């Protein structure tokens, strides 16, 4: 927990960004940010331009548990300091409503971003795609080594900042745009490891499985839903065939842009045994070095 609250009096309401069970997210502008610039709130001020922030707000009528989940997320957010994780700029916890304030990424989520691009045969290059994926891996390595499990890694939960900087995020909002990505059994089954689906065992190993699917989205430039050839029920049945491991299961196909070695890395992310899936340190090293060095 930060010593001091960010001052609510400085948040100028622009727009409601969304909503979930917890409450809501607003886009705010920081009023006269140059006066707030300190060691405790190091803000990137640009004279003549609004400093925009996202603010996640706990509903006033929230339950004891919801309030506790929210404060747990505050404590977690306060720790995460890494170039590829969304950054906590401040909090408002003295009074209700409880708030978390983050940087605002104007390029939106990675899925929106890549969906608007096409591959360099607005364009994006294969090296840049590897750089995107390397940043996600690096963010996930940081998370894993702080003993955190994400549980919902996907391009929809990555944000694009400036100069192709990617930040892993976790919104907790219900966004109609991605409703088809979740299945009520409410779970992101197409990104989930077989053991998650069949048992509910969530681990860094299942985050690696999700990273694999996320790597596939990126290399597909987010043009198809993973396993779009399978209905939701059939995705569940497919998990059963991974457990079966008699080779009957459906694997995501090699994207056109993906060379064989990168595809086989993805395949290892989908190894039936968790311990054979590569750690994020290895995934990052392979994307930042081996894959980049063999363009
Ligand atoms: C087992 C469950 N895991 C535990 C570890 N958690 C880590 C975590 C938690 C919260 C967020 C998180 O992200 N929280 C958050 C905080 C504040 C706000 C305002 C918020 O959401 C925003 C909504 C819209 C926009 C932004 C933030 C920035 C923007 O440009 N738009 C989310 C991000 C992570 C991450 F990245 F490490 F994985 C993930 C769940």
Swiss-Prot record:
It comes from the Eukaryota. Tyrosine kinase that functions as a cell surface receptor for fibrillar collagen and regulates cell attachment to the extracellular matrix, remodeling of the extracellular matrix, cell migration, differentiation, survival and cell proliferation. Collagen binding triggers a signaling pathway that involves SRC and leads to the activation of MAP kinases. Regulates remodeling of the extracellular matrix by up-regulation of the matrix metalloproteinases MMP2, MMP7 and MMP9, and thereby facilitates cell migration and wound healing. Keywords: ATP-binding, Calcium, Cell membrane, Disulfide bond, Glycoprotein, Kinase, Lactation, Membrane, Metal-binding, Nucleotide-binding, Phosphoprotein, Pregnancy, Receptor, Secreted, Signal, Transferase, Transmembrane, Transmembrane helix, Tyrosine-protein kinase. The Gly/Pro-rich domains may be required for an unusual geometry of interaction with ligand or substrates. ATP binds at residues 17-25, 56. Homodimer. Interacts (via PPxY motif) with WWC1 (via WW domains) in a collagen-regulated manner. Forms a tripartite complex with WWC1 and PRKCZ, but predominantly in the absence of collagen. Interacts (tyrosine phosphorylated) with SHC1. Interacts with SRC. Interacts with MYH9. Interacts with CDH1. Interacts with PTPN11. Interacts with NCK2. This is Epithelial discoidin domain-containing receptor 1. Residues 2-295 are cytoplasmic. Residues 11-287 form the Protein kinase domain. The modification Phosphotyrosine is found at residues 126, 178, 182-183. One of its GO terms (cellular component) is extracellular exosome. Autophosphorylated in response to fibrillar collagen binding. The active site is at residue 152. Belongs to the protein kinase superfamily. Tyr protein kinase family. Insulin receptor subfamily. GO terms for molecular function: ATP binding; collagen binding; metal ion binding; protein tyrosine kinase collagen receptor activity; transmembrane receptor protein tyrosine kinase activity. The keyword Transmembrane helix applies. The modification Phosphoserine is found at residue 32.
């Amino acid at each position: 927990m930060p010593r001091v609250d960010f001052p609510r009096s400085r948040l100028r309401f622009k727009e409601k960004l969304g909503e979930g069970q917890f409450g809501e997210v607003h886009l705010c502008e920081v009023d006269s940010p140059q006066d707030l610039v300190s060691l405790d709130f190091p803000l990137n001020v640009r004279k003549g331009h609004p400093l925009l922030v996202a603010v996640k707000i706990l509903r006033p009528d929230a339950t004891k548990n919801a309030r506790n989940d929210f404060l747990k997320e505050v404590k977690i957010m306060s720790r995460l300091k890494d170039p590829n994780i969304i950054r906590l700029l401040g909090v408002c916890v003295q009074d209700d409503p409880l708030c978390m304030i983050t940087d605002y990424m104007e390029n939106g989520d990675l899925n929106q971003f890549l969906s608007a691009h096409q591959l360099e045969d607005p364009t994006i290059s294969y090296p840049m795609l590897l750089h995107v994926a390397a940043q996600i891996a690096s963010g996930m390595r940081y998370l894993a080594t702080l003993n955190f499990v994400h549980r919902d890694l996907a391009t929809r939960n990555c944000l694009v900042g400036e100069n192709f900087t990617i930040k892993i995020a976790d919104f907790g909002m219900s966004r109609n745009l991605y409703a088809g990505d979740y299945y009520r059994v409410v779970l992101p089954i197409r990104w989930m490891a077989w053991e998650c689906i069949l048992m509910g065992k969530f681990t860094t190993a299942s985050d690696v499985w999700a990273f694999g699917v996320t790597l596939w989205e990126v290399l597909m430039l987010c043009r198809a839903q993973p396993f779009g050839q399978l209905t939701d029920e059939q995705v569940i049945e497919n998990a059963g065939e991974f457990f079966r491991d008699q080779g009957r299961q459906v694997y995501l196909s090699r994207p056109p842009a993906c060379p064989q070695g990168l595809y086989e890395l993805m395949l290892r992310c989908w190894s039936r045994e968790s311990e054979q899936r590569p750690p994020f340190s290895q995934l990052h090293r392979f994307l930042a070095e081996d894959a980049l060095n063999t363009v």
